[PDB]
């Protein structure tokens, strides 16, 4: 129920433990006025130190004029920070506009087509995004909700995505969760405590080339559907076999325990651990950080369900690419596709109650 | 606070506390022979008390044969029961099947044509319900994901909807939630303590009719989509004119606390509370039991989120059909759209680990 402190060197929802709930937004710029844009950017920033705090925006949710509307929506009222971060990132396509063309960071790249890639273009890209993270959905949507409405006129929802339950770890001294392939997800991750671990391969220095990108990182959203039918009918050996890991105890082949380390060479050469492992990437490693999610049925007589992947990285040149394309031989693939795709440059932290979202591109 | 019964005279899920997260799900039946049925339904009953008490079905999720597929699919090993309760229903269409049409209950009702109704034919009715509700969403989803697996190739799921109430780690057990419009929802309702009012309102009663129906229920699912964005541009007095109580307390208008009685003359005619109460409608009085959605956002930017209303009741000719009735000039329905609708008749319980789901209809 605690709140996560809003400032930092970093955004908080990236390092933070990782909260039960996903509201991600992408998000439309509609105005070509940058000084209007970067209002919005600081009424954006002082919603969301409300929000991370569990009080209402502006000047609250009731006890205003009665002729006005209320400024905050109320749906959160009487509710706890439940652990909400917001994080916001700026897509590809925000360098269109603005004159800031010659800002875009070298490693924002636009990701190559992968074999099996079935995208669809209107829940994919977005100029520029907000994940909201909460141990409670009705906190994370209030804060989605707010925003949007703030920025009514500057800003329009290009697509959303909830994420039910999560995926993914950052705190290893913690279960880690199951994926709706009923495998743990999330065993070798970069930890929050990882401090040496962040600086090598998830925060942008800058040393590598784009000033306004120091202590920010860069995330690849993938949205995934699973083929549970298929799946489902997989046996027991075919299944751990895919992974490389046993499904109840979720250890490498061979082994005991959850976090004995992986001996790659007793998985099958087309295990998704085996492919994805830093060892066959050349060292490259990977913040993983999504969650689960079922949007309905499919319309032949089966519950819809995949996975809204998430990563965080340095550089989305040496993390996400060089992992995914070693995944073209991935024995997962049978089972998964993936229909949607976005990039984004998250700034770094907001350092103070005087700095503001974006204020070192602006 | 960790497991509910699944054994009793009524199923769990109607009068038992009431959980964070649902997962409903509609089905439709495939096969046409009654005994394969009713070897799912016996199926189904099994697996429902290994999964109410946080045990996977059949023989488990690992260690069986390599060769074989697990029993169950995984993904709630290692979550707690989570207060688990797993509510069937039977939908009119069923009783086209196996022979059932004189067995039809008169309570179940086929609902008229409401003003405003804009029903997608798809995301409505359904042979068979589940109700699945529990603090984790995870173990509800999982418990509807293993059913359609075990019940593939005689059902198919129809729709399927996720909703959301409070989170009790954080939230007092007390307090009222808010739905999405940011007023307390639920503050006069039936209690799962009433047991009088339940007999009254909501269980099925022999001398009603339906004798395979005593102790059962009668459910209404309504797929309520909410313009939040049009309802967020109106003011604050035109949001508590709209249902008669202030948006911060709770308080009917004219009155300092949420559980202070509504003065139902102080309210503007189409308010919705004067409109619904049943002192506006015979007495007519219901179970709500609904949770909030929001399933993302549509083609044009809005959020698609609403409420997802369930309603017990021991009749729907007379409990939600009159109530939603007198909502014809109901302030709120600017602000509203119902999109779904399905009814379900909701069978005694399960009285004992011999017993299975619907013997009382099946025999
Ligand atoms: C639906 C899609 C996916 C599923 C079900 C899945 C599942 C798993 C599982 C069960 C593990 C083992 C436990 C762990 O260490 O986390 C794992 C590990 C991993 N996955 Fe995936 N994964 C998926 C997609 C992806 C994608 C798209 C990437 C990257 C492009 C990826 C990268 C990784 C990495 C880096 C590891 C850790 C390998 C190691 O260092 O041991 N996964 N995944
Ligand atoms: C999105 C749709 C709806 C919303 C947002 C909504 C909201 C509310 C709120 C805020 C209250 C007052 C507090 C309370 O006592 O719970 C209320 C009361 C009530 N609502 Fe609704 N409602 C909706 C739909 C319906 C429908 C479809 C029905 C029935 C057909 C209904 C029946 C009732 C009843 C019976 C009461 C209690 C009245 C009393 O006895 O004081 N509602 N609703």
Redesign the interface.
Known sequence: ?SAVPFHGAHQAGIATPVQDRL?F?AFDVTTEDRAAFVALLKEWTAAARRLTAGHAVGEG??????????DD????????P?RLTLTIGFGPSLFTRFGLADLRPEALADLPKFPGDNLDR?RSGGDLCVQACA????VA?HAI?NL??IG?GKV???????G??KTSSTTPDK?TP??????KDGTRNIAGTEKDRLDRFVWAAEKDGTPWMTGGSYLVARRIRMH??TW??????E?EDVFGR???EGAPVGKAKERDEPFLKAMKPDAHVRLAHPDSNGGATLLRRGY?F????D?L?????GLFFLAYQRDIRTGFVPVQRNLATDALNEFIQHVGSAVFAVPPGVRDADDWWGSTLF
């Open positions: 129920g509201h937004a949710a009731y006890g205003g004029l009665p002729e006005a509307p209320p929506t109320g749906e959160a009222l009487g509710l706890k439940s209107a141990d409670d959905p009705q949507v909700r949007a409405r009514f329009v929802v290009r697509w959303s995505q909830l039910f339950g279960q199951r994926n709706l392939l009923g495998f549970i039918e489902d009918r997989a046996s027991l050996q299944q046993d499904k109840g689960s079922t949007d309905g049925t319309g007589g089966r519950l819809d369900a």
